[PDB]
Design an enzyme around this catalytic site. Sequence first.
Site, PDB file in Angstrom:
ATOM      1  N   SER A  42       1.060  -1.147   0.463  1.00 15.13           N
ATOM      2  CA  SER A  42      -0.004  -0.242   0.007  1.00 15.13           C
ATOM      3  C   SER A  42       0.690   1.165  -0.245  1.00 15.13           C
ATOM      4  O   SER A  42       0.544   2.051   0.406  1.00 15.13           O
ATOM      5  CB  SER A  42      -1.024   0.221   0.663  1.00 15.13           C
ATOM      6  OG  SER A  42      -2.502  -1.100   1.196  1.00 15.13           O
ATOM      7  N   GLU A 140      -5.733  -2.758  -5.888  1.00 14.20           N
ATOM      8  CA  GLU A 140      -6.455  -3.632  -5.030  1.00 14.20           C
ATOM      9  C   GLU A 140      -7.177  -4.584  -5.027  1.00 14.20           C
ATOM     10  O   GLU A 140      -7.948  -4.193  -5.311  1.00 14.20           O
ATOM     11  CB  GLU A 140      -6.480  -2.520  -4.071  1.00 14.20           C
ATOM     12  CG  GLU A 140      -5.285  -1.146  -3.297  1.00 14.20           C
ATOM     13  CD  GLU A 140      -4.905  -2.049  -2.688  1.00 14.20           C
ATOM     14  OE1 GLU A 140      -5.651  -2.696  -0.495  1.00 14.20           O
ATOM     15  OE2 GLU A 140      -3.820  -2.005  -1.638  1.00 14.20           O
TER      16      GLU A 140
END
Length: 265
Positions: A42, A140
């Site tokens: 991330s 994601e």
Amino acid sequence: DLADRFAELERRYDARLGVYVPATGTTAAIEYRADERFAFCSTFKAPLVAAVLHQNPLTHLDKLITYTSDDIRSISPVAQQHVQTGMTIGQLCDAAIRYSDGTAANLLLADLGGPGGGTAAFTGYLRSLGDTVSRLDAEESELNRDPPGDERDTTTPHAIALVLQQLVLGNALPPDKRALLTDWMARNTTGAKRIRAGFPADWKVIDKTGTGDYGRANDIAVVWSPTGVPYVVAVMSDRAGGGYDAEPREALLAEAATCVAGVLA
């Protein structure tokens, strides 16, 4: 010697560690496997926000984005509460950095536009900064597989440190957009046990975490010494020798940051 300390962390945690801290007027660079590739995880969400800020006027931050439960992919602590209200681009930026909100990231990718759900646009943003190394390839998702040795979705400590340098401390962004990035990263909720844990309390720390399988734990930060000197600190780790299920080790990042703190202090 600092390189030995980093090697000892690798042996004690059964991990591969990468560290880059760019040189300054007053300090040497710190580099340990700084040109080896690690998974973004991330950590890409910080330059993602910089990309959205860059390509748009700040009034864009009030665009309401509506989405559905079908867009919820990945840990999304904020977005999961606003499926029926939507969220503004500003709120998405906030959540993406401060809560590494995955859905938020995905919506910001979409906001950038172009192929790959925005991953192309993101990667081009980095290319435009001078980074020919980093690449984002996937949106994601909790279903994503990213085995070691696949160069997709990787950066290097050296690459992402210099990107963050440009963004927060350089002239990649105009000062008003820069301040929003800095502020969001300054109020990150996910980074207390990583770089922050290795720096004394009187050092200011802003950061973006990344975590994944194969024991991947990353943190990218900008720190301000008590004497007003800022430094970029990129730490990346994985434990691929342990396979998919290797536990991420935050403490490794904290201790690597401690070794760094020791030398900039």
